[PDB]
Amino acid sequence: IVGGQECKDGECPWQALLINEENEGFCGGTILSEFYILTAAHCLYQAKRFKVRVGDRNTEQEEGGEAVHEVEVVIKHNRFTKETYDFDIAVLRLKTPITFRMNVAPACLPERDWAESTLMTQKTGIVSGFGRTHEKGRQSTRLKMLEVPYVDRNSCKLSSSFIITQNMFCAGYDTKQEDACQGDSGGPHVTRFKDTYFVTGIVSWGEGCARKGKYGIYTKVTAFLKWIDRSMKTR
Amino acid sequence: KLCSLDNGDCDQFCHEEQNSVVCSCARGYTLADNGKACIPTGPYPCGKQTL
Ligand SMILES: COC[C@@]12CN(S(=O)(=O)c3ccc4cc(Cl)ccc4c3)CC(=O)N1CC1(CCN(c3ccncc3)CC1)O2
Ligand SMILES: [Ca+2]
Numbered sequence A: 001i002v003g004g005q006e007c008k009d010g011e012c013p014w015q016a017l018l019i020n021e022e023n024e025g026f027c028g029g030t031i032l033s034e035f036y037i038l039t040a041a042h043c044l045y046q047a048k049r050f051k052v053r054v055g056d057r058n059t060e061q062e063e064g065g066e067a068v069h070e071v072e073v074v075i076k077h078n079r080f081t082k083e084t085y086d087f088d089i090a091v092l093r094l095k096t097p098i099t100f101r102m103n104v105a106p107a108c109l110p111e112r113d114w115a116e117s118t119l120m121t122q123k124t125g126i127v128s129g130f131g132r133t134h135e136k137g138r139q140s141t142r143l144k145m146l147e148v149p150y151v152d153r154n155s156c157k158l159s160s161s162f163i164i165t166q167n168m169f170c171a172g173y174d175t176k177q178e179d180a181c182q183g184d185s186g187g188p189h190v191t192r193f194k195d196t197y198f199v200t201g202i203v204s205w206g207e208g209c210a211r212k213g214k215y216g217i218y219t220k221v222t223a224f225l226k227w228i229d230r231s232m233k234t235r
Numbered sequence B: 001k002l003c004s005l006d007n008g009d010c011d012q013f014c015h016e017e018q019n020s021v022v023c024s025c026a027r028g029y030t031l032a033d034n035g036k037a038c039i040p041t042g043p044y045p046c047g048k049q050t051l
Helices: A112-119 A153-159 A225-232 B003-009
Strands: A015-020 A025-031 A036-039 A050-054 A067-069 A071-076 A090-094 A124-129 A144-149 A168-171 A188-192 A197-205 A216-220 B013-017 B020-024 B029-031 B038-040
Touching (some): A025 A050
Antiparallel strands (some): A025 A036, A071 A090, A168 A216, A188 A197, A197 A216, B013 B020
């Protein structure tokens, strides 16, 4: 997260953090329930074996409310490939139930039509994670959240230098030095409507970090809902 | 009518029944009496900052 604030206690309770054997945090997640996590598809490459952590807000200080969960099964998307990054989405089923407490609650999956009509038409959204602080920086120690304006779908394709498909959507700033970044991947993009946050998008890719004339490319969640279900009902 | 005016005055999901609006809520919620608001069931409902 380049720029942006810091997640105060209880503010970003749905954040999840995939960690490698080296205990390092390399990607993010979204708690969809006590048993399922929503991550990116490319986050399922950068590693051999990994766990999912929750409740963490400071990656080096026993806040007592943290907790590690193993991965029973991993549901990666079939139409996905690195050559386009299209269909960047995957769903994790935990080996043991997430116990919701302070700094550990799940986000809501909204309905498709209502999400597209009233959520993504909302001005801004919220992206969060432990990723880098500037393009060439290091994983953050504290948890960050950035308010990222929704970007005109058109501008999106122009400003980009890659095919912005229907499964993705731009978000961020043109000039301003605020964007998600490396490590923030798989993280959660949530829209806020009446003090109840919804899972609108999955952190995916971008060209650099906070670069002028470039935006944050997130995975369109509404365009995978039915899939996220058939994934939780396991399939 | 019109989920366009202000989400039909709903709390979460807003839909239309060819004449009036019908509100609904996310898993773990229950639609109140006024048929517009939503209310939790557990102490950790999806979408709420654990404050
Ligand atoms: C190894 O390369 C890393 C990276 C990600 N990073 S990154 O780790 O800093 C990174 C990752 C996810 C992000 C998500 C948001 Cl919303 C904002 C900034 C982000 C920055 C920047 C980059 O230019 N690249 C290029 C790349 C790989 C190639 N690519 C496409 C390929 C085919 N079709 C579309 C896009 C764009 C992303 O990954
Ligand atoms: Ca910690």
